[PDB]
Design a protein around this ligand. Structure first.
Ligand code: 5D2
Length: 125
């Protein structure tokens, strides 16, 4: 099976704005995660064809990745900083749903999540 289409990253019919918190999420939170040694499996959508994960999209129905998150932040897709935070937590959660405890991939997610939460705890008002 092919992969599914990637999540939406721009919508004409969705209102759009810029916030202080949305800047921190891009300029601080995404940047820091993006440069982490274990960030690479999360920088684009799960390619089940390339990675030979034939059931990935049978089990995961709400895919998300940092690649999408970046695009969404750059095209002003988000209205609320809460929407963006939900996207990160979806990404992490999918990992933990699909994979077993201790698989390499889970350890790489858990390392990034630790860092995510550290940065989210210093989000501005
Ligand atoms: C995204 C995503 N969601 N589910 C999956 C399943 C596989 C998958 N890939 C992409 C990455 C592949 C993988 O696990 N590669 C890891 C390389 C091996 N390293 C081994 C050592 N390592 C590591 C990471 C965290 C803690 C510790 Cl101690 C060592 C870093 C990772 C397996 C195939 N991506 N994925």
């Amino acid at each position: 099976s092919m992969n599914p289409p990637p999540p939406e990253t721009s919508n004409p019919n969705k209102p759009k704005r810029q916030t202080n918190q949305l800047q921190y999420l891009l300029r601080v939170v995404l940047k820091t995660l993006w440069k982490h040694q274990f960030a690479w499996p999360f920088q684009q959508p799960v390619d089940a064809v390339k990675l030979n994960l034939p059931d990935y999209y049978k089990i995961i129905k709400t895919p998300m990745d940092m690649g999408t998150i970046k695009k969404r932040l750059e095209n002003n897709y988000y209205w609320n900083a809460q929407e963006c935070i939900q996207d990160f937590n979806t990404m992490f959660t999918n990992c933990y749903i699909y994979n077993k405890p201790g698989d390499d991939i889970v350890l790489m997610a858990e390392a990034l999540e630790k860092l995510f939460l550290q940065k989210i705890n210093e989000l501005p008002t």
